[PDB]
Amino acid sequence: ARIRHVQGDITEFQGDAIVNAANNYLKLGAGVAGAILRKGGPSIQEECDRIGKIRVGEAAVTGAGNLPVRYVIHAAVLGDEPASLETVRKATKSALEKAVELGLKTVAFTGVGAWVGGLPAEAVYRVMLEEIKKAPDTLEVTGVHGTEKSAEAFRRAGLEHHHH
Numbered sequence: 001a002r003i004r005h006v007q008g009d010i011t012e013f014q015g016d017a018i019v020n021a022a023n024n025y026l027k028l029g030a031g032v033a034g035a036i037l038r039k040g041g042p043s044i045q046e047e048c049d050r051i052g053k054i055r056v057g058e059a060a061v062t063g064a065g066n067l068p069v070r071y072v073i074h075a076a077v078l079g080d081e082p083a084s085l086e087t088v089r090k091a092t093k094s095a096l097e098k099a100v101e102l103g104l105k106t107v108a109f110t111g112v113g114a115w116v117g118g119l120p121a122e123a124v125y126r127v128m129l130e131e132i133k134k135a136p137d138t139l140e141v142t143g144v145h146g147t148e149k150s151a152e153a154f155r156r157a158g159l160e161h162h163h164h
Helices: 032-040 043-051 085-101 121-134 148-156
Strands: 002-007 017-023 059-063 071-078 106-109 140-145
Touching (some): 017 032, 043 059, 059 085, 085 121
Parallel strands (some): 017 071, 106 140
């Protein structure tokens, strides 16, 4: 799938869904997850609670409440077990699978938060970007970034390496 990177606020992304790095208990925590909770409103956590525990590496779909998207895709990267490059790979793949199942055309993710935590960012971004490449071209993926340092780190992890 095609990926584009912008500076912005993922809670203001207009499109079909946003992907939220999650714990496998679907308990919305600090930072961006907290903005999702506040802007989306209580229906998001209420639905997460109804879904219950999922597997680490799985992704669960909820409504998005008052957010300008139709869904939040909660990609479980940690919880029962700590985050690893492997759980990151599985979760990104699972999130993209849900987008395909739901027939989505535009989805956003962000590079901060639980995707990285105690992992090396560059390696995480490379793993995510590999999974995003496999996704169908009918799907447009936007990376929404807090800062510019973040966005170009993503463009760098995205460039193909050729002889000089």
